[PDB]
């Protein structure tokens, strides 16, 4: 199979310093131009850098130019992105994708072929396992959920009643406070006659920090 | 400053679907269309304006030349939500256009609304989270409006939501208010007040700080 594998994303601090890969397989890589494509959290695709086959022409977006060198070992079947200077506006997801040629002189271009990305984070916080905090159902239909606050970074995962609740839940996708640590919730919306009887637990694990926590979620104590 | 238009559109299942771009420039090599689904990767749908990629949907379509460029699908099916990109190659730049999200027409759905107050457990911490919780609805456009003894707070809430429900085709939407213990215990009356077309007037949802 045709395929493109990007590595090397993690967290890295402001001002510094990371290389990424894209290994290359199922094909003649040394054939093809190749491109750095990025996308921002909630933001739209954004080109990057392009190499040529041989790696004698390279192109970069104005954004990344003076920063970002792009490079390949066609004997490694391996292309590379040095980033230095390191931005928070650089964090992203970094797709490689082939370039195909056609047309006239094989002048023509489009990107056919993609990795699944990796991920850099572009911060100076630390390791922080998060605070579960219950939302706890008013004193029909009910809600209720977890408050999964103030980790770092990214990702959390949540079950409810260890993976046996999951009819009527919605995990929220984590929103990055100005604080830089993350924070999330999950909720569920249950019947209130079950309010007295079943029991509702929020199964968090931060493997960042080798934080697992289960939260029972039950009417406040008044 | 490559555009496309609309920004977003709904649209059922069997709708015509019709997205269009604008190149910055007179197109000099090919403009291309990519779509892109929630969580996965782009992939290439139409090359050099028209051409269908190899295994694509006979459904989808190109057309265009110059600057103007258009996208069809003749047909939408369930599988087709996702965002959609134009890409030019011009002045030795690739560039994408800003995308067409496009989501599934139901018919609307107000929601319904919960407001959580801050645990007693986070308060010891020194900081208060409230939560306001919109669940179920459709279209996705709506307004959260966090009020604290009758003051709009504005800059000290974070939102999300869910991408469309695969069954029903709803969002969800959380909202968080965060404030100092010592700010918290300043006020008393904690409101979220939401705004959606399904509503005939805007709900609130709201608690007195220390009440059952």
């Known amino acids: 199979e045709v395929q493109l594998v990007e590595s090397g994303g993690v967290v890295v601090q402001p001002g510094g310093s990371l290389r990424l890969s894209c290994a290359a397989s199922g094909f003649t890589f040394d054939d093809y131009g190749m491109s750095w494509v990025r996308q921002a959290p909630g933001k739209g695709l954004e080109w990057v850098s392009l190499?040529?086959?041989?790696?004698?022409?390279?192109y970069y977006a104005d954004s990344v130019k003076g920063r970002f060198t792009i490079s390949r070992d066609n004997s490694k079947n391996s292309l590379y992105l040095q980033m230095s200077s390191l931005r928070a506006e650089d964090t992203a997801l970094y797709y490689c994708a082939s370039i195909a040629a056609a047309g006239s002189f094989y002048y023509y271009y489009y990107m056919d072929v993609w990795g699944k990305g990796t991920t850099v984070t572009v911060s100076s916080a630390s390791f922080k396992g998060p605070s579960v905090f219950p939302l706890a159902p008013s004193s029909g239909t009910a809600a209720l959920g977890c408050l999964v606050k103030d980790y770092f970074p990214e990702p959390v995962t949540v079950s409810w009643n260890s993976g046996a609740l999951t009819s009527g839940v919605h995990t929220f996708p984590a929103v990055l406070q100005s604080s830089g640590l993350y924070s999330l919730s999950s909720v569920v919306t249950v019947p209130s006659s079950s309010l007295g009887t079943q029991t509702y637990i929020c199964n968090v694990n931060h493997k960042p920090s080798n934080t697992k926590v289960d939260k029972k979620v039950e009417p406040k104590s008044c | 400053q490559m555009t496309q238009s609309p920004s977003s559109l709904s649209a059922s299942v069997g709708d015509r679907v019709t997205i269009t771009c604008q190149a910055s420039?007179?197109?000099?090599?090919?403009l291309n269309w990519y779509q892109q689904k929630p969580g996965k990767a782009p992939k290439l749908l139409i090359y050099?304006?028209?051409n269908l990629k190899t295994g694509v949907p006979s459904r989808f379509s190109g057309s265009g030349s110059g600057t103007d460029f258009t996208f069809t699908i003749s047909s939408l099916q369930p599988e087709d939500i996702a965002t959609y990109y134009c890409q030019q190659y011009e002045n030795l730049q690739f560039t994408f256009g800003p995308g067409t999200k496009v989501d599934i027409k139901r018919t609307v759905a107000a929601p319904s609304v919960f407001i959580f107050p801050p645990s007693d457990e986070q308060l010891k911490s020194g900081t208060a989270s409230v939560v306001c919780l919109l669940n179920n609805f459709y279209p996705r456009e709506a307004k959260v409006q966090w009020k604290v003894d009758n003051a709009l707070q504005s800059g000290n809430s974070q939102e999300s939501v869910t991408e469309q429900d695969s069954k029903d085709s709803t969002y969800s939407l959380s909202s968080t208010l965060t404030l100092s213990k010592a700010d918290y215990e300043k006020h008393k009356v904690y409101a979220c007040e939401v705004t959606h077309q399904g509503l005939s007037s805007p709900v609130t949802k709201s608690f007195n700080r220390g009440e059952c």
């Open positions: 420039q007179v197109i000099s090599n090919y």
């Open positions: 050099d304006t028209s």
């Open positions: 190499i040529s086959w041989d790696g004698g022409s390279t």
